[PDB]
Design a protein around this ligand. Structure first.
Ligand SMILES: [Zn+2]
Ligand SMILES: [Zn+2]
Ligand SMILES: [Zn+2]
Length: 132
């Protein structure tokens, strides 16, 4: 429960989110997460690279935008986007209960950029370019 605990101490202000991997909870941050404020480890960098823009037969992305996994997910209704966010990531990073309330424009498409501890990066489009 490493990611849960690290996020718990972000909220308690004992830790900076930029110092944790927001995907897996590794403290071995190698990089800035290109979409959201928070760190990312190398293993998750490779996951992101490998999983990015893989699609399921439903026409929505196969893997959660934050963690690269997920079963039950929220799916973006912006057809230029088609991203998914798993319910566990949403409840962890936005806050408890936030997944079932969301159940839609996703966190990348919404007007607001801040949702709980989840904060969209202003230069995200050009960060992905750098990332890839
Ligand atoms: Zn990681
Ligand atoms: Zn996830
Ligand atoms: Zn979207």
């Amino acid at each position: 429960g490493s990611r849960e605990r690290l996020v718990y101490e972000v909220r308690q202000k004992c830790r900076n989110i930029e110092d944790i991997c927001i995907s897996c909870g590794s403290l071995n941050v190698t990089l800035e997460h290109p979409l959201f404020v928070g760190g990312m480890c190398q293993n998750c960098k490779n996951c992101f690279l490998e999983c990015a823009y893989q699609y399921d037969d439903d026409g929505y992305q196969s893997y959660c935008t934050i963690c690269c996994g997920g079963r039950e997910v929220l799916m973006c209704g912006n057809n230029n986007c088609c991203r998914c966010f798993c319910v566990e990531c949403v409840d962890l990073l936005v806050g408890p209960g936030a997944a079932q309330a969301a159940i839609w424009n996703c966190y990348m498409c919404g007007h607001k950029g801040t949702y709980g501890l989840l904060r969209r990066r202003e230069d995200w489009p050009s960060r992905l370019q750098m990332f890839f």
